[PDB]
Design a protein around this ligand. Structure first.
Ligand code: HEM
Ligand SMILES: OC[C@H]1O[C@@](CO)(O[C@H]2O[C@H](CO)[C@@H](O)[C@H](O)[C@H]2O)[C@@H](O)[C@@H]1O
Length: 210
């Protein structure tokens, strides 16, 4: 009854807590791991952002949720520049491979792309980008504080082109609230958002294993 933004936040609250408290991310943010582990995270993130942004491009071109799907949010290119700095060269592009979690995640994003599934893509968009614009700011700060990571290797978290972020988020939620969705599309979107958080928790679990 309070609009889609609120329903998404409430709907995914428990899944958010599970991802945030994963052993890998918990250890990362409290200073127990290192830049190597952060780097492995960001390499997996490059694979799934690449897939997410192909799906965004498809859905944006279809005409669905256009104002929400702001190209300033695109991360794949800044992320690759971060990885170039973290790894010291371009070597990582041909070394990295998708964890099992990331294979499932990418596969689903590729399904959304080729189906041009607007509702599903909005879900995935919200789970990643609003998180980047939220908890990601804390992540960036702790990578600097605990591990001495150069801010220039955290371009992913900076969102060049965006100034006031709370305002940006507020407007993001207004756009969510204003999307024209049938009951079936809204239900599909909410279920997808839970799956997005599920994939993201498993990315952390698989990083935790090796
Ligand atoms: C893959 C992991 C994560 C995902 C997908 C994610 C996603 C999200 C999303 C979608 C929101 C916006 C909720 C809304 O307003 O509707 C959010 C907010 C937030 N996240 Fe996360 N998050 C993740 C990890 C974390 C981490 C590890 C922390 C640790 C501090 C964290 C802290 C927060 C906080 C405090 C907010 C509220 C807004 C803010 O403080 O800026 N998140 N997150
Ligand atoms: O606020 C982020 C996100 O966390 C959740 C649980 O996923 O709420 C918890 O954290 C809040 C502070 O950030 C507390 O206020 C709240 O009471 C606690 O459950 C989500 O509800 C929220 O979207």
């Amino acid at each position: 009854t309070a609009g889609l933004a609120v329903e998404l936040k409430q709907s995914t609250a428990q899944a958010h807590e599970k991802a945030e408290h994963s052993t890998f991310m918990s250890d990362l943010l409290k200073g127990r791991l290192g830049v190597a582990e952060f780097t492995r995270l960001q390499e997996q993130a490059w694979l799934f952002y690449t897939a997410l942004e192909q799906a965004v491009d498809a859905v944006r071109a279809s005409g669905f949720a256009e104002s929400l799907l702001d190209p300033a949010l695109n991360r794949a290119e800044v992320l690759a520049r971060d990885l170039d700095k973290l790894n010291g060269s371009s070597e990582w592009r041909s070394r990295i491979t998708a964890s099992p979690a990331v294979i499932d995640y990418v596969n689903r994003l590729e399904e959304i792309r080729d189906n041009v599934d607007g509702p599903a893509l909005v879900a995935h968009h919200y789970v990643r980008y609003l998180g980047d614009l939220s908890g990601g700011q804390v992540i960036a700060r702790m990578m600097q504080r605990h591990y001495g990571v150069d801010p220039e290797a955290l371009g992913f978290y900076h969102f060049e082109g965006i100034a006031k972020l709370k305002v940006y988020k507020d407007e993001y939620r207004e756009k969510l609230n204003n999307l024209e969705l049938s009951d079936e599309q809204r239900e599909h979107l909410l279920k997808e958002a839970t799956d997005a958080f599920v994939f993201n928790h498993q990315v952390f679990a698989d990083l935790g294993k090796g």
